[PDB]
Each structure stands twice: as structure tokens, then as C-alpha cells.
Design a protein around this nucleic acid. Structure first.
Lengths: 85, 80, 205, 82, 61
RNA sequence: UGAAGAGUUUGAUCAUGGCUCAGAUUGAACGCUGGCGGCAGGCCUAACACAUGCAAGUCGAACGGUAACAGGAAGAAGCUUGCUUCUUUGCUGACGAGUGGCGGACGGGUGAGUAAUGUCUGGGAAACUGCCUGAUGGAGGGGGAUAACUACUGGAAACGGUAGCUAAUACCGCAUAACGUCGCAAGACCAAAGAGGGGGACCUUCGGGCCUCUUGCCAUCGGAUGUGCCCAGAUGGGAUUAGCUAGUAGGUGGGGUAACGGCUCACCUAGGCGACGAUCCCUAGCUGGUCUGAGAGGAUGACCAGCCACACUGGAACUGAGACACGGUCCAGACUCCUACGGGAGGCAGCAGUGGGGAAUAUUGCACAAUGGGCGCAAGCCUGAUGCAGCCAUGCCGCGUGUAUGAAGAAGGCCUUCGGGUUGUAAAGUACUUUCAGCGGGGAGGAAGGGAGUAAAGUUAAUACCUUUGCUCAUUGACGUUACCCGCAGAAGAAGCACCGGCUAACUCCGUGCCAGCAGCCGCGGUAAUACGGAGGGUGCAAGCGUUAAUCGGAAUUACUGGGCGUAAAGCGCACGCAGGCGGUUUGUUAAGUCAGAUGUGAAAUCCCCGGGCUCAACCUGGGAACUGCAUCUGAUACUGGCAAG
């Protein structure tokens, strides 16, 4: 019907695709941390986290996540690394 | 410290949790007889340190599990 | 609203002179007071404990021309006031402008007062009022507008008033033909044979 | 968006407005927070046309409340008068 | 069953009628009392008093 | 300020006991009738199907731009001697389509679902909060794009695909660095945007920089507001529903959300819920309130307002501060329709209207002038919200339909002892009045504001600009030929409806002859019948008046206030007894019940009171009272409960 809705629709499809790419990118730099947590290496997990920390915190700043889910993923991975070794 | 609802624990079996039964008068709204209405309510007890039948002093906390929102502050009676 | 009325078969039923007509009409002079209101003559009236308050409620309604809707509204706003419910009814019926323009001495019957009021003639507190139900508050000064000061009626109907009694809760300066409802009428000076404690049981069923 | 708009409450052809403090998202004759004074547009010294309770308006305005269009005039037409 | 009271009768076997209520006291359970002169059932003949309770309306008079 | 009874079982009466009636109210309907006007309501049924029109946009001060329109600018030309026919330019106002921002989550509808983590009251913590507000800072630099647009370009269509094109406050990196997050601490890591207005003064590749103005931007901390979550109590019928429950109850850990939590997963414990009614079934949106009632209570929940839930039926999620989203997306199904049959399109529980169903419920209006809302720097656009109009006696309120005087009681009717009485001063006639409707002219108030100039110490440039004020000028009303006022007519246009045996105010005559019929009850009709039908007369109410339906009352007829059980209905056939319910007496203690006081809260409107404004009233409205509650705190300690001693 309305001219608004059929622009907000294509706009939301574009934003869907772009947001989806960002979140399925960050869900790789968290699973790279997990694949080292289960691997039981302190150092490899340390690099995995020190590379995660921008990406999960970068878009929490300006997008998908916001500060509380970024805080959660930082915290409950620092905690898991600490008690790894 | 809100009103620290005194109650008598019913069943301390369940792990780190109890069942405290509060008892209350209330005048019957339509007939006027002071009836005794119990208020059973799950309480989180952290050490299983209270046995059936001793009056405890419980408090409102954030929900701690599905249907468990009370913890006690201190016990004022021994089970036996 | 007023319904053109039962004429004198009105007052014949109640017995007492209910003033729809005023003049030499007090004596019979073609009125035939209580010969018969109709088909049967002086049939003995076997009124029940009910009929003798319907009779008085419609003595009161039909003195003033009030009706069942307005008379029950008057009943309710007389029964929510403070004090004697019956004297409250008579007070708020006596303060009615249709009435007061009569008790002033203007006109000759409350139908004439109801018509003068409705025809802009009576003007109270300096602003024209043509509602007959306007409850005249005390200390008001009722008048007659300039157009109707000498119209046809109040020059003679006023002379038909001095032989009549002077109601003592309002004063009439007939020489200037403007009056002042000075204070609230009471039961005692409102010298009527009306038993309030029949009406009040009629409505308080 | 707490606002100090007006709600129309009087009968037909004769509007009466309460100066209400309510947020924007509510319909003007929906919910509200505080009722600080009224406005009766009718004139010719029937009565006071406005009573307004300036201290609660000043409080709300200093608390982040957007004082609306007609009521803005209502404020100073009081202050200019007194 | 509905009673067709009035001063005379005018219905048929398929005319649509407007049932009313108000039990009749004689028949063993005719407790609806058809309205006169509202739906396709005519009024009553030459009837002057209580004329509203039947479907006839103001002879010139 | 508060409280009524009557009839009816009998030859008859005292009681029981139902049944009926008299009051008030309705989102009413129907029957007969009808003049106004004010205020207010108006599909209660099929959450059935929906023609057709409107119901959601805005900003060119974000940016490519020109699709038009206009201001034109330039140019070629008509001379048309300086006027205007043409070709380019977005150069300008401005603006279609496009990207972008914000709003489509509000406002508006409905009550299907929901019997309860939904609603109401009262507390609480483990949370976010676009717009608005205070404080603090930051606000450098770079990139790759893609619609627009161009040109091909399939598809009947719906709708696309190729090749170039292109900017931005779009998008993303970089330096960026806490008052941030993670972390014990160290350390680590994280953002952003420009835009206009005038350029004083200067520079200017004359881009603009640069000064300045305004506004926007990023980060953090508050605020307010909104929302999420939690707990307790209270919220329908059925026990002819007595057992239910395995992520089910809890605990470890992961994982998950803004946030706690079985919210989810692995594991372990074997619980949890239930007579104080779980589970199951039926019905139902919930509240302030409405009606009724002396009141307790009962019945309700259309209007108005707060919360909830749904948006053709059923799944899901995206985008976003906020949705699982009426006029948004994907998917199914039923449909309705286009279809070239290969495929597509739609959702009035918005407004008005249509078909249907129904006893029953309205216009396919006017304006955004007010109030509010969205976007905007503002002018402004948009608003089926809203304001008003239309229809409808649906209600409530106010008015009118004439007023006086008038007999030999005019005739004429009714009856009639024929005497007359009655209809009845009623009529006619007599003098007069014009309120409403009619005609004519006067005629507010709802309009505050916004526009154009004007002083500014404000701001810096000093006036520039902007800002607010102050002043001046002109300007905005749908309704609406407004209310109201004044002139002109003449009684000129304005009365019905039920009822009359008792209950109940109000009876006579005739026809009928258990027939036609009536009827709320008692009961009438079989030769007068004040009960049916007609006439005259009266009674009651009056633009109404009757009937049906519905609720409460009366009904003390579910009885808490406020009933009973020998014989009227009603003591289990009798015991024992768990749970339950009650508990002698003195002292001490507590202070849970109780009581007093206090503090918050009990939305607004409703209800009541004293007012006030509409010529009165309905109606509107100020202030109070009231909301009989809940929670917290402080006292008392007689009575009830606890604990102890007897």
C-alpha cells in the first residue's frame, strides 16, 4: 500500500544482509576463542581473545551488540582462559 | 529487611532450597470470621541448615530459580 | 410543556379554588363549583389511603401548572436539601419565576404569568428571562421590559392585586411596577391548606 | 518528550482545557502525569479564564519537559497581567 | 406456538410474523403472543380503543 | 436524610410457602403519535464477506540530481525598438522519481483469545530507555562503494537481469581514549558529520579557508518519561473434574537475553504441586465505574478513561531505542480476483459505505479554523485523530402549542326520573399577547498565533546575521446566512397515548349472548357486561404514551446485616475419629489478631458538598469532601493467639 512501507522494506532487507554479515563474522572470532579453550592452550586462546576484543567491541559500539553483550563475551571468555591454565 | 516474613519450614529435602509456610489471619470479607490462611512459599537456604518445623525469617531476593524468590536472613528456632 | 390545561373541571375535582381563572370567578358566576366534573354528579368519593395523596399532589401540581417530570425533579432536589422535605418543595415551587410574577401582583393567574414570562415581558436582574422555571434567587429585582411596560395587561391585572393579600416574603412597588423577592418564603407565611406530609409519602414509596 | 499540552474537556461549542503535563505519545485525551491548572477560552470576565500553578510548570520544565504551543502563551499572558 | 389475539383474524399459513412474549393463560403453553400490525400481519378491523396494541392507526376522527 | 406493601391454597383462619403485581434503570425493540431546541448516545447479532473513496507522512538547511512548474540566466532569432518566438544551463525558487534521516511500535479499531506471571492493590531488583534536559569532554585523517542516471535487457503481467554511472550526515577502515567495558591490578579495546546563515576583518588555487552565528554530530555520567522482570494478597461456575507432574522441582556447570530466572543444553539430586481445591471441563477481556438497593449485597463492564490481547487462520523472525508489527517481510492454508494458465494480486476488529445475519443501530459529509500528533531551523505539508455538521424522539433537560372575559349554560351529542344534568366558560363572541417554527436586518465568542518592518546593551562583526523581548502595520473560523438582539404578521403552524371491576386515580349507555373476545394476578363472557366491542364521560402521563425484553428491588425467597430443621421442606440409622473449628483459671512474656496515631499510596473523570458559567435546567466547571483499601512506622496491651510456669 503505502510508499513508506515499501521503502522501509527494501531498506530492511539491505540492513538485514549487512547486519547478518557482521554478526556471522563476529561469530567466527568467538568460536576461534572457543576452539582454543577446548584445545587447552593458554597462548593461542590469548591471541584469539586479543583479536576478538576489537571485533566484538567494535560493533557493540555502533550496532548489533550493545555494551552489555560485548561485556558478557569479554568476561565469560577472560574467565574461561584464566581457569584454563 | 522489608517485613521478614516469619514462617515454619515444611520440607527441607530439596537441594539448597526449602518450603516455608507462612500462616496469617484474615477476617473473612463477607462472613466476618477470622480465618487462618497459610502462605506456602519456596525459600532458598544456602546450606540445607534448617530442618522441618522451625520458624525462620525470610526475605525477598531477585528470582533465584523458577518459583524461588526468597532467601532467609536468620533462624530463630530449632527444628526439634 | 403546559398542555392548555383542564379549565375549571380542574378545580372542581379538588374542591378548593385552583386559580386558572381569576376575577369575579371566586363566587360561582358561571363556574358551577362542585356540581359535577362530568358524567356522574356528586358521587361520594371513596378515595383510598392512596387517592388522598394523589389528590393533594395534583392540587399542588395544578395550582402552578408543574408536571410529573418537573414535579418529581422538584421532589428530588427538595429531598436532597437540608430540613423539612415538604417545606423544601413549597419553597422551591414558590421561588419559581412563573409563580413569583404572579405573587408580585403582575398578571391575574399563573397562566398569564407563564405567558408574560415566555413573551420576554418579565426581566430579572436587568437581563430578559423567558423561562418560566427560573428559580428566583432571593434579593432579585424582577421587572417588566420597556416594550411590555404598558402592553395591555399589567396596568389592570395589577389593580386586580391590591384587594388580594400581600405576600410578605416579597415587596411590591406597584407604583413603579418593579418588585424585589427580598427573602426566602417560609411555610407559615405561605398560608396554604396544603398538607406536605401527604405528598412526601406519595413519592417516598 | 514530557509535554505541557492542553486537553479539551468541555461540552460541544464550549471547550474547557486542562493544562496537563503528559508525554507526547499519549492521545491528548489519554493518560497523563500531572494536571497543573486549566484554561477556559471563554471571555468577557465570566471568571478567571486561567489558573495555572507556575511552580510545578517551572519544576517540570527544569526537569526536561517541553512546554507546548498554546500553553506557552498561557504562561506569559498571566505574567504580563501579573 | 403463538397466540394471535385481537378483534378478528387475518394471517395465513406462510406469512412471516413477529413473536413477542407475554404468555397466554389458557392454552397449555402458548407463551408467546404475536405482535399485531408490525410485520406482514395486518391490524384489526374497526378498532378504536387501545388501538396501539393492535396494528390499526388513527381513523380520521 | 435512612427502610411501605397488595393479591392468591379455605365454608371459612392462623401459619407456611411459592407465584403474580405496584418502583427504578436500559447501547433497547416494536405499536399508535409528533412542534421545537440544548447536551449526550447510536451493529449488543456474523472476529461473516467486503465493492469504492479516504485512514501516513515529512525534510532540497544530508546528498546525486531535473521528471516536470515557475524565477529566470545566457544564447539564436520575431522586431514584437527593445519588446518576446526559440536552444542550452539546475544557475535560482522549487520539486517528481532515487539514495538518506526521522515518523509507519503512536494515534484509531475490536473484544476473538485469555480463568491466569492477564487485571487491581502494595512492595521489590537483576534492566534497558529514540525524542527532551543538566554536566563533562571529543568533533583529525582515509577508503571502497550502490541505487539515481545511462544503454542493453528477459517476463503477458507481476516483476527482473546485463553493462557502465554516481555521490552523501549512506557504509567501512585509520589515529582516535576515559568520567567507559573486560580485568584483582597492570594492561587491552572501543567511537564521530556535517550542514547551513552573514561575512565584520583578512586570505582565497577566489574552491573556500578563516572569525563568527545557529543547529546538528560522537562518548560518559545523571535526570525525567516509557517499558521489561519479580513477589504477595484479591480476582468466575463445576469435586457428577482428586489426583497432576520428568525439564517436571532443585543443584552443579556451560550456553543464552538489555536483565534475573530451566530461559536452553549435559550432568546429578527425586522432588514439586494438591482438600487453604492442584489437574481437567465450561464460560469470560480486567479495572475506575454503571444500575439497583436504607445498607450490606446483587447484577453488570455500551459510553468516558487506565491496563491487556488480537489484526483473514497458523508458523516465524528481520529492521529498529522500542514490534514478533492493522494499512510491513518470508512461509504455509482457506478463500476473492488477474492470469497469456505459465503465474500473480488482497485482507475495512481505521472511517463512510456495501451484501448478509438481525427485533434492532446512522453520511460512500466539512475542515484541519481550534486541540493534539508526525516530519521541518521555519514557513509549511500530513492527520476518516479531532473539531463540527447530517440521520435517528434513543435518552435526559428546557420550552411551545395561546392569555384573559364570557351563557341562561350557545347549539349538537351522552344519558335522562325527561326534570334536566353533563360535555361546560369549554365553545362562539368578546379585548389582548407573540415565546418557538416563518420572513428581514442587526451579530459576538471560540484567535492564541504566524507574516512584514522596528531597539537591543544580547551574540560576536561594532551594527552584520541570529536570538528573545518591546513596539508598529497588515493577516488566519470548517462550523456558519453561529449563538444572541431587534422589526412584521396573527392566534395565526404545533396533541396524542394508555386506561377506568379489585390490586390503582378514574363509570355510565348500547351491541354481543361461554360467541366474539379479554387477561399481570384474582378472574370475566350463557340473557345489562362499571372486566369483551362501540359511544359519552373521567383518570393518569404528555411529544410522547403503550407493549415486549433485561437487571436490581419489593424477596427476610440463600437470611453476614437478616431465616429455619417435633408435625409445614429440612437432624445422617448409630457411633468412633484424623484434618478443621472452638476452648476453664492465675501470673510472666511477646505483640501476630486487635486498637490508637502517623507516613506514603488509593490516577483523572464519575458519586456527594459549597460554589461558578451557559437567559433556567440537563450540561460544563473550581475547591473540598469522599475513594470505607493497602503497605510502612510508632505507641497501647483489655480481649484473642504464641511461648513458659503453675
Amino acid at each position: 500500500n503505502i510508499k513508506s512501507a515499501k521503502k522501509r522494506a527494501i531498506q530492511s532487507e539491505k540492513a538485514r544482509k549487512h547486519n547478518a554479515s557482521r554478526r556471522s563474522m563476529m561469530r567466527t572470532f568467538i568460536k576461534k576463542v572457543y576452539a582454543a579453550i577446548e584445545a587447552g592452550d593458554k597462548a593461542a586462546a590469548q591471541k584469539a581473545f586479543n583479536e576478538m576484543q576489537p571485533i566484538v567491541d567494535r560493533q557493540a559500539a555502533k550496532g548489533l551488540i550493545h555494551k552489555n553483550k560485548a561485556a558478557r563475551h569479554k568476561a565469560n571468555l577472560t574467565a574461561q582462559i584464566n581457569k584454563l591454565a | 529487611k522489608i517485613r521478614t516474613l516469619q514462617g515454619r519450614v515444611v520440607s527441607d529435602k530439596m537441594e539448597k532450597s526449602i518450603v516455608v509456610a507462612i500462616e496469617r489471619f484474615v477476617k473473612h470479607p463477607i462472613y466476618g470470621k477470622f480465618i487462618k490462611r497459610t502462605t506456602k512459599l519456596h525459600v532458598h537456604d544456602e546450606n540445607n541448615e534448617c530442618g522441618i518445623g522451625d520458624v525462620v525469617e525470610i526475605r525477598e531476593c531477585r528470582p533465584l530459580s523458577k518459583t524461588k524468590s526468597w532467601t532467609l536472613v536468620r533462624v530463630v528456632e530449632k527444628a526439634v | 410543556a403546559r398542555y392548555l390545561g383542564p379549565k375549571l373541571k380542574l378545580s372542581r375535582r379538588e374542591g378548593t379554588d385552583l386559580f386558572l381563572k381569576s376575577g369575579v370567578r371566586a363566587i360561582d358566576t358561571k363556574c358551577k363549583i362542585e356540581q359535577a366534573p362530568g358524567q356522574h354528579g356528586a358521587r361520594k368519593p371513596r378515595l383510598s389511603d392512596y387517592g388522598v395523596q394523589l389528590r393533594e399532589k395534583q392540587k399542588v401540581r395544578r395550582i402552578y401548572g408543574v408536571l410529573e417530570r418537573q414535579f418529581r425533579n422538584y421532589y428530588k432536589e427538595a429531598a436532597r436539601l437540608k430540613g423539612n422535605t415538604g417545606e423544601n418543595l413549597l419553597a422551591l415551587l414558590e421561588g419559581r419565576l412563573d409563580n413569583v410574577v404572579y405573587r408580585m401582583g403582575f398578571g391575574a393567574t399563573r397562566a398569564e404569568a407563564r405567558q408574560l414570562v415566555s413573551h420576554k415581558a418579565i426581566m430579572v436582574n436587568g437581563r430578559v428571562v423567558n423561562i418560566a422555571s427560573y428559580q428566583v434567587s432571593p434579593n432579585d429585582v424582577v421587572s417588566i421590559r420597556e416594550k411590555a411596560k404598558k402592553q395591555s395587561r399589567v396596568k389592570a391585572a395589577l389593580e386586580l392585586a391590591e384587594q388580594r393579600e400581600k405576600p410578605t416574603w416579597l415587596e411590591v412597588d406597584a407604583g413603579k411596577m418593579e418588585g424585589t423577592f427580598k427573602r426566602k418564603p417560609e411555610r407559615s407565611d405561605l398560608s396554604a391548606d396544603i398538607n406536605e406530609h401527604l405528598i412526601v409519602e406519595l413519592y417516598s414509596k | 518528550m514530557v509535554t505541557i499540552r492542553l486537553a479539551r474537556h468541555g461540552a460541544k461549542k464550549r471547550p474547557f482545557y486542562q493544562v496537563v503535563v503528559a508525554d507526547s505519545r499519549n492521545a491528548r485525551n489519554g493518560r497523563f502525569i500531572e494536571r497543573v491548572g486549566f484554561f477556559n477560552p471563554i471571555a468577557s470576565e465570566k471568571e478567571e479564564g486561567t489558573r495555572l500553578d507556575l511552580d510545578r510548570i517551572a519544576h517540570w520544565v527544569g526537569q526536561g519537559a517541553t512546554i507546548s504551543d498554546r500553553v506557552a502563551a498561557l504562561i506569559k499572558e498571566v505574567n504580563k497581567a501579573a | 406456538t403463538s397466540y394471535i389475539g385481537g378483534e378478528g383474524h387475518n394471517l395465513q399459513e406462510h406469512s412471516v410474523i413477529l413473536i413477542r412474549g407475554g404468555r397466554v393463560k389458557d392454552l397449555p403453553g402458548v407463551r408467546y403472543h404475536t405482535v399485531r400490525g408490525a410485520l406482514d400481519c395486518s391490524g384489526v378491523k374497526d378498532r378504536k380503543q387501545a388501538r396501539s396494541k393492535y396494528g390499526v392507526k388513527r381513523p380520521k376522527a
